[PDB]
Symmetry: C2
Subunit: 925 residues, 2 copies
């Protein structure tokens, strides 16, 4: 009978913003006032309308009028610096635009949706306004800036400009029901694409008495006392008020997917017109009946099941019976005498907000549905004698009461009728639960580690590290927030939080250009770091910056001499993404070589030297290669992406995969063949043709002059401008070591039996090439710095370069690591990230950057020896976040209890604070 | 690739209204101007802005400005009487509202959709406005009426009030692209229900120089000469203009169903925002590319197939290259160098209509698509050096040219970008052909009649009667239109019309309260009648009235003594609905009695007396009963519906079917059994028990006093207050005839062997009741006047009353025909319609109405003897239409060539004329 004809989604409400009379600037303040039954109407403030006063003719006319209603405590204040506006431009801005910008920010903050994440997205803005009062002050004389400020279209266009919204931006105007119409258009859009999020609301302002005087001149419209008595025997008119409100709307499927908290659900809505009634301003009950029937038909809900109606409630002796009649025809039809539809109006509390009444009504029901209480309707001294509630199945709820839930759930209706004839109705219902629902030995070692780990935790439970993010568009604002946050944490409410809720809440706040992160294990550490961050004092557990870096990060894949007894073990057990990719690489290696690496990573006795019989030279490279892949994909899972990559003789395979030149399977083949061939080749020869490598503190120019006396020696790696790795027979290297010592130059030996990038590789090329057949190089798609091609930068989209000859050249010939780093600095890159079990290449990079004139380079280190594998990747992510690099900070705080225990999560941290300064347009008249 | 993801309909355009500069008040004037390349820009009129002038400070500031653009010749004029507005209220009405009311009327008139037919329907109004200039004049001092007049919401709400629209009524505001946005919302609504017709457009007005001065103060915005040079090397700004336009939109399926002419088709549309660009007023090419891609994706059209683009064309040196760039990215991508997308802008002809540019652009393309020509773009002195048209696959069409039709059809795009960032695009295509597509002897006699009819037509072809309808809200306006229409008919253009096109066009005009109809066979007769109607002179071929009657018509089903040789024959051959229902009744009678009546109707020799062996008393009733059913259903087919019904001893069966008490089959059984039983019963007895009936000029009171001496006599029918039909033995009736003659009272005998409503029926009741078993009386659903229950009115929805005992009582007891008529007059009924082959009961009704004090009763007569069966039902329909009764006058002019020869139909009759009087708000400053 009343089911949907069209298959459409239900819209979800995730945010609310309030700027209503009575200092109701937040939903929490609004909810308390409604329960207490607060009358927010008050006399005209002494400082309002002063521009028109001082003229005896208009002044006495104003006094004769009523001039009593809801007025904002502060309307002139405005934080122009926050919204990037000049004083001259700000002074010529209608307060309607100011409210929209402020309300939009609060709504997203209330919805815990970072405003930065919505930049460039398809977000629609639908706002209702009717009166351009502010434009009258400008024309009293003026500046051209008043054209944009006082325009109605700019009310929404400006919002979509500051927040960078790429969706529809229109300002509707249906008089007293504009807010509901704007909500209707947003709901219809989301059901028909065209957007993913929608900001819907309305705004009004009483800047001049022209409209108020006009209504008083008509007579019988304004109440003498300024109080509304919706559905009462003492109705005598209404009073005009100012304010605004906003809502955030998303498809219920998206809200469930994204983890957003759902406060209420909009099942459907409808709008129509009264047509030819007994005058333009005379309501027509017949049309009101149709829109109610039209709305509930779309919502797929039988009106007999409704529990509460937020009526228009204009306190008119003649217009109230008409509204009740229509409700009885549709809503109050067939109901038992003991199941009336509760009735109420918010205008009794706040007044008649012309273009914002719908927003106030929607907010009231949204909070009521999110909670489980129905606030009363004040100013009810008895039923209207001209309305038969018993016959119409209605009841005016003038006391705090709970939802009857006739149908088992909560359903509400919001109705708003304009004075020109336009009508609208919105159907709302509570959120339901249904809306929240759509290798043998390796196992043996794995079980032992988990049992040992669990047993050790019982003796000493470790305290999890929590990164607390603080950000703002200015450093001064950033540190002010930290001090406010620290004070709240020290308060009993803060002490009663898990310290993971606080991080989760902060991760969902706007991530500005000036960013800071605090690494705290408990509340006390967080307070100390935040207090230090309140000023410029440094702190080991505090990361801070003043602005983002120009260019993206560079990933370094060296993976040489960075192995120890237990690497990749702790993070494998305590992380899933890292373990997942480790297994995938293990399976590929098992297919190729026939053995698993997990038997080595999980085993503790193995130290990769004399503990593994199967060519320790081979396994070491494979384990490092697997770790590099897992770390890179882990960073990708959190949103990180590399602008450029570079490797040093061992990470070329990993670098290719990250860039995109080769697939994971193809890259695994290259490293496996390279590693196995080197291991067997080194064991094949011993004593006769053995050649070892050593490190020498020499430059490229010095190497050419000194290699003349030593013909057989070759250059292997250009680690640093003043350092180089060379290989050759022990006698030649021994002489070089003695020669360098004679000149005071530091040198080493690396104590490594293996030797790559020398003549030993020559026999291996023939068989190496055959094994590598079948690989399919692809376009890079990412910046590259080939150490084998003389450190020449390669742009994304270039032709494939990872052919077989590429790997043979790298294995045999030297690698220009230092040259590539210098070229990257020339292009402007300043942040370098190393993926390895132990950072050893950062020192080499630091020397190159300093030699190139860069001394404040960002050297980020992944897993390091003798440090917890966790709490080191978290720090690496924080540094990327601080310096403006790509990172989804919300991924570090996954939700455990979605829809079950939301109270303990999402702590009540302080909100963003604005510095409001007077901005008004002088006038004399 | 570009096909639709969602299954949605294509929207059709059926009407256009224009109020653009250059006296372009009609599409025909607009189309001619575009072809001629007319520059509608002109200097400021001397009579404009005089209120602000006379002040030296503002006056010299205005002169220093440009003050050159498109201005309306007459803006103050307004026909308040037509729209029911007082002088005080009209003076405080913004011209934007006035244009919307006028444009809406013209659009429906252009679309040939009666505005009266849309009253109470789900019609949406979406109108774009940005500046409330008129409100500044009111506040210079004022009246409260300025609140409604100058409000933006009332621009659309007032339209939906005057025309009684029950759909959405909202006023959008997106600055310079509001008109396109309004069109977008209407298109989306129609695809998602919520409405059946949509009025979309925009309006602007230049009442004050405040906005013009502001732009001049900025500098670099307004052109010094006021001329726009869209896409030219001499672009130096633009000029502001005023005007408005409207369109009528319907789902293409509905337009095809209703016969509406389709001018163009809207495949799809889209809107978005520029986001954070280089300033609020700086356009963003990236967003423009997305909306074009977004729009064509919805339209299911590949952009490479577009043939013409109606660009924004603001004549800005910096904004024009940006628009071209986006077009090249999407539209001009992959095109051959010899297939460019033609480019043009209407702003060059009219100027920059802020909130009405989209309406002007849509109208231009709509006329171009309806025709087969592309108008040029004026002010093109060479391509812009900063735009590479060859590389972007674009061409500025500066000459009259035909559609290239790259894809085989015509496709166009309209783009409008606001100064705040909002953007929109609409895709249009021409209307295609595919869019316009989804009883033996009786036959022998039927063929003879058709051949004889066709043969007779050749000797003398009959001239078809055409009812010409003229109507208006006042008699004076009605007769003024007739004189204008008559003059046009006498003109060569009128003489070149079929005279059926003229009627068809008039049938689709608004049907007001004051209505008139002219029955003309040729043009000369129509002119003579219209000229007579121009004044109060009467004319036999002219039907006129000053206002509708209060209550609905009453249908009278007597069908006694109204048979002749050839009844229902001429209309059966020349009408389909009448023939259809005749056959259905014939089949039912064939099942019951076993013979067909068509053998009698079609036969000419039969005269229903001595020519039919099968009980002429029986066949006569059946033939009359069949005719009554056919006429009633024929009237229903044209929209007529009865408020009440009444019958006289023979139409009770037909009256029951029309009311709804009984089904057609059940009613047929009652008459068949009644007729057959009477025929056999009368033949059963002869001489001994034969009793005949006679008419006597006596009243009911006189009958009671006179029946004392004659015991056996009975009253049969109370035909009139002073007349009565009685039955009895011939001796008793003979004495009554002599007695009446002795007193001078007229009497007759009826020369009828049969006699009903007497003792002869008593034996027939027993068998009559058995035959009638199984009938299922139902609720009436219509007013009834039972002549068997003492003429007591019965309201609709009453319990069934047509049980078996009801028919036995009527057949045996008298019928109170006069009493029922008097009761109907008491209830207020004044129009009586008789369904019978020959009107005989009207005389009886006329006497009763006069006796009750009603002398101007509307007595409408159906088919009459010795008159053409056609041209008599047409007159009956005209009288119902004239007196305000329900009738779809469009059904009398069916379309023959839909989409084939539309030129010869839908003549170019004069349009509605308004009397405009000055209505302006004085101001001093």
């Amino acid at each position: 009978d009343w089911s949907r004809t069209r298959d459409v989604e239900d819209i979800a409400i995730v945010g609310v913003a309030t700027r209503f009379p009575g200092d109701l600037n937040t939903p929490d303040e609004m909810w308390e006032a409604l329960l207490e039954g607060k009358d927010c109407v008050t006399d005209l403030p002494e400082d309002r309308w002063t521009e028109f006063l001082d003229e005896p003719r208009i002044a006495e006319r104003v006094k004769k009028a009523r001039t009593r209603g809801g007025y904002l405590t502060d309307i002139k204040g405005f934080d122009s610096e926050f919204f990037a506006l000049s004083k001259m431009e700000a002074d010529n801005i209608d307060p309607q635009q100011r409210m929209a910008l402020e309300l939009t920010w609060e709504a997203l903050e209330h919805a815990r949706i970072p405003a930065s994440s919505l930049r460039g997205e398809s977000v629609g803005v639908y706002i209702g306004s009717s009166t351009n009062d502010y434009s009258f002050l400008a024309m009293s004389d003026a500046h051209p800036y008043a054209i944009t400020g006082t325009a109605s279209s700019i009310i929404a266009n400006r919002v979509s400009y500051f927040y960078d919204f790429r969706g529809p931006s229109v300002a509707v105007d249906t008089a007293c029901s504009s807010s509901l119409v704007a909500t209707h258009q947003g709901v219809q859009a989301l059901r028909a694409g065209e957007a993913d999020v929608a900001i819907v609301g309305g705004v009004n302002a009483l800047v001049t008495p022209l409209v108020t005087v006009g209504f008083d001149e008509v007579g019988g419209v304004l109440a003498p006392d300024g109080r509304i008595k919706s559905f009462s025997s003492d109705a005598d008119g209404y009073a005009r008020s100012e304010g605004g409100g906003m809502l955030v709307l998303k498809r219920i499927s998206d809200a469930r997917r994204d983890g957003d908290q759902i406060l209420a659900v909009i099942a459907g809505s409808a709008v129509n017109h009264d047509g030819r009634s007994n005058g333009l301003l005379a309501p027509n009950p017949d049309a009101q009946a149709e829109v109610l029937r039209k709305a509930y038909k779309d919502a797929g809900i039988n009106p007999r099941d409704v529990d509460y109606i937020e009526a228009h409630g204009t306190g008119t002796i003649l217009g109230d019976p008409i509204e009740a009649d229509a409700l009885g025809r549709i809503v109050g039809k067939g109901r038992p005498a003991d199941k009336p539809a509760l009735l109420g109006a918010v205008k009794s509390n706040l007044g008649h907000l012309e273009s914002a009444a719908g927003a106030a009504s929607l907010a009231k029901m949204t909070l009521a549905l999110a909670n489980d209480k129905l606030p009363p309707s004040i100013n009810y001294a008895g039923p209207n004698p001209y309305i038969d509630f018993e016959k119409e199945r209605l009841k005016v709820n003038d006391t705090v009461s709970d939802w009857p839930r006739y149908s088992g759930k909560a359903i509400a209706g919001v109705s708003g009728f304009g004075f020109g004839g336009a009508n609208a109705h919105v159907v709302m219902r509570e959120v339901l639960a249904g809306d929240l629902v759509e290798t043998e030995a390796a196992q043996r070692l794995l079980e032992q580690a988990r049992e040992e780990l669990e047993a050790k935790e019982a003796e000493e439970p470790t305290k999890q590290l929590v990164p607390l993010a603080v950000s703002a568009f200015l450093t001064s604002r950033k540190r002010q927030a930290a001090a406010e946050l620290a004070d709240w944490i020290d308060s009993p409410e803060g002490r009663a939080s898990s310290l993971e809720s606080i991080g989760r809440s902060l991760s969902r706040r706007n991530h500005g250009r000036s960013r800071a992160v605090v690494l705290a294990h408990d509340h006390d550490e967080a307070i100390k770091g935040l207090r230090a961050l309140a000023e410029g004092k440094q702190h080991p557990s505090v990361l801070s910056a003043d602005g983002p870096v120009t260019n993206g990060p560079v990933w370094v894949l060296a993976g040489f001499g960075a192995q120890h007894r237990k690497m990749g073990k702790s993070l494998y057990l305590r992380n899933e993404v890292f373990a997942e990719w480790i297994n995938k690489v293990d399976a590929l290696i098992q297919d190729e070589r026939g053995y698993s690496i997990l038997e080595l990573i999980l085993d503790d006795n193995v130290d990769y030297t004399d503990a593994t019989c199967e060519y320790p030279i081979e396994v070491v490279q494979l384990v490092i290669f697997a770790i590099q892949i897992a770390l890179g994909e882990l960073l990708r899972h959190h949103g990180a992406k590399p602008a450029a990559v570079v490797g040093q003789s061992l990470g070329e395979a990993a670098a290719s995969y990250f860039a995109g030149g080769l697939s994971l399977a193809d890259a695994t083949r290259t490293i496996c063949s390279r590693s196995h061939l080197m291991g067997e080749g080194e064991a094949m020869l011993f004593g006769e043709y053995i050649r070892l490598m050593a490190l020498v503190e020499y430059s490229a120019d010095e190497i050419k002059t000194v290699f003349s006396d030593y013909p057989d020696l070759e250059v292997c790696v250009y680690a640093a401008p003043t350092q180089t790795v060379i290989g050759g027979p022990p006698d030649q290297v021994d002489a070089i070591i003695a020669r360098a010592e004679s000149e005071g130059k530091f040198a080493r030996k690396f104590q490594t039996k293996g030797a790559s990038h020398t003549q030993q590789m020559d026999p291996l090329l023939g068989e190496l090439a055959a094994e590598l057949q079948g690989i399919e190089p692809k376009p890079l798609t990412t910046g590259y710095f080939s150490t084998v091609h003389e450190g020449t930068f390669i742009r994304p989209g270039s032709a494939p370069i990872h052919d077989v000859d590429y790997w043979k050249k790298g294995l045999r010939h030297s690698v220009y690591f230092t040259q590539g780093i210098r070229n990257a600095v020339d292009n402007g890159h300043t942040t370098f990230l190393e993926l390895a079990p132990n950072p050893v290449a950062l020192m080499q990079v630091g020397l190159t950057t300093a030699s190139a004139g860069l001394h404040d380079a960002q050297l980020i280190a992944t897993l390091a020896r003798k440090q917890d594998e966790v709490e080191s990747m978290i720090s690496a992510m924080a540094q990327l976040y601080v310096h403006g690099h790509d990172l989804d900070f919300r991924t570090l705080f996954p939700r455990r209890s979605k829809g079950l225990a939301g109270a303990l999560d999402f702590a009540n941290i302080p909100p963003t604070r604005f510095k409001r300064k007077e901005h008004w347009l002088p006038a004399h008249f």
